[PDB]
Amino acid sequence: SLRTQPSLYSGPFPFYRRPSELGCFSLDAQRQYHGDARALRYYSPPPPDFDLRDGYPDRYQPRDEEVQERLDHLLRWVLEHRNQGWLAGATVTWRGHLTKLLTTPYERQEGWQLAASRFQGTLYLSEVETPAARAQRLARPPLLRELMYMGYKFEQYMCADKPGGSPDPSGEVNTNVAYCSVLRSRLGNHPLLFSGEVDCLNPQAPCTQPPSCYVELKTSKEMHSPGQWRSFYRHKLLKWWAQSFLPGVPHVVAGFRNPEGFVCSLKTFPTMEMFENVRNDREGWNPSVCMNFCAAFLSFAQSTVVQDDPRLVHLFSWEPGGPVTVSVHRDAPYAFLPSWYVETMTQD
């Protein structure tokens, strides 16, 4: 087991390598994979009065969340690019999985599970939906469903499909569509290969080379008091920082929503400056604690997963308050590396 309290992980900010984009892939409106950037949209801010409720629900095509894709689309990319043993000493995951590790020392509400499998040296990490999270997903109240749509809608007001184009929110929001950047990094002694969904690219960004040219878009409720801002800095900026820090996305652009579902204000939060909001806060978060924990977890997983075997899973389970605990599983349902990937890699 691995303890999770922040005090264990205070100390110097560890080494995190400047991320390089190795490539990308797109999922289209039918969730079919394409090894190019067709799904990538372009940051096109107002020059805001955005109705995030517009099109809900008649122009809404939500992804079927029952389909658990796990690492499948990343593994296709890896398979088609394993000529770009560095991989053997790496850990392969989704950006979002690493985000959840980053936020663990401070997370008090949502637990997680991560399946680990070692296969020809490489450590693969793939999130498992917990029974409790599966319960909440199926029991999603109308208001949660509207809120989620609103987050996706915001993007349609802020992005165009061509550089410098005008946003066109008259169409449908279809959440099968995704653009994913594939990045290489390293946290201390742990080489990383991961994909992350990317909201848009800013043509007028100072550095036009990805991932620096990318922008993350967010919505949050409007705030009218120091206390509301302080809770926002403490809870939501931590999540936003941990999401955008990893892939090297330098800006998060937030639209603040009315209780009536309109965005009438925008604010840019540079990733590099987010921690400043809580640096002198007795109940704030700390990016060095986030990264030190993550590095500790990677070391823990790497020493725990001894056997090289794609049918074997070490399930890392964590609930708020407690340590990360481990259980050992084989085959269904936890085994996540598909035959089509294992055989092709074995073929080499």
Interior angle at CA 123, CA 321 and CA 211, nearest 5: 85
Helix 72-81 vs helix 339-347: angle between axes, to the nearest 10 degrees?
20
Under rule CB under 5 A, residue 217 binds Mg ion = yes
Report d(CA 73, CA 266) in Å as an integer. Answer: 33
Name the minimum Å distance from CB 217 to Mg ion: 5
The reply to whether 80 sits in an annotated binding site is no
201 binds Mg ion (CB under 5 A): no
199 binds Mg ion per the rule CB under 5 A: yes
38 has binding-site annotation: no
Between CA 237 and CA 216 the distance in angstroms is 13
Binding mask 142-181 for Mg ion (x = CB under 5 A): ----------------------------------------
Find the shortest distance in angstroms from Cβ 151 to Mg ion: 7
Q: Which residues of 89-110 are buried (b: 16+ CB within 10 A; e: fewer)?
A: ebbbbbbebbbbbbbbbbbeee
**Structure-token pair, residue 87:** 């991989």
Stretch of 10-18, 196-204, 254-262, 338-346 contacting Mg ion, by CB under 5 A: 196-204
**How many Å apart are CA 312 and CA 309, to the nearest integer?**
5
Residue placing its CB nearer to Mg ion in the complex, 179 or 316: 179
Closest CA to 245 of 202, 294, 306, 204: 294
Taking the C-alpha atoms of residue 52 and residue 158, their distance in angstroms, rounded to an integer, is: 11
Cα Rg for the chain, rounded, in angstroms?
A: 20
Residue 348 to residue 342: CA distance in whole angstroms:
10
Q: Phi/psi at 215 (nearest 5 deg)? A: -135, 140
- State the CB neighbour count (10 A cutoff) for residue 272: 12
In the complex with Mg ion, the residue whose CB is nearer, 130 or 220, is 220
Is 217 marked within a binding site? yes
Q: Is 274 annotated as a binding residue?
A: no
Nearest-approach distance from CB 162 to Mg ion, in angstroms: 20
Size of the site for Mg ion (CB under 5 A): 2
Stretch that binds Mg ion, among 91-99, 116-124, 162-170, 209-217 (CB under 5 A): 209-217
The nearer residue to Mg ion, 217 or 237, going by C-beta atoms, is 217
105/199 with CB nearer Mg ion = 199
Annotated binding-site members for substrate: 31, 69, 94-96, 180, 197, 218, 243
Annotated binding-site members for adenosine 3',5'-bisphosphate: 148, 199, 243
Positions in the binding site for Mg ion (CB under 5 A)? 199, 217
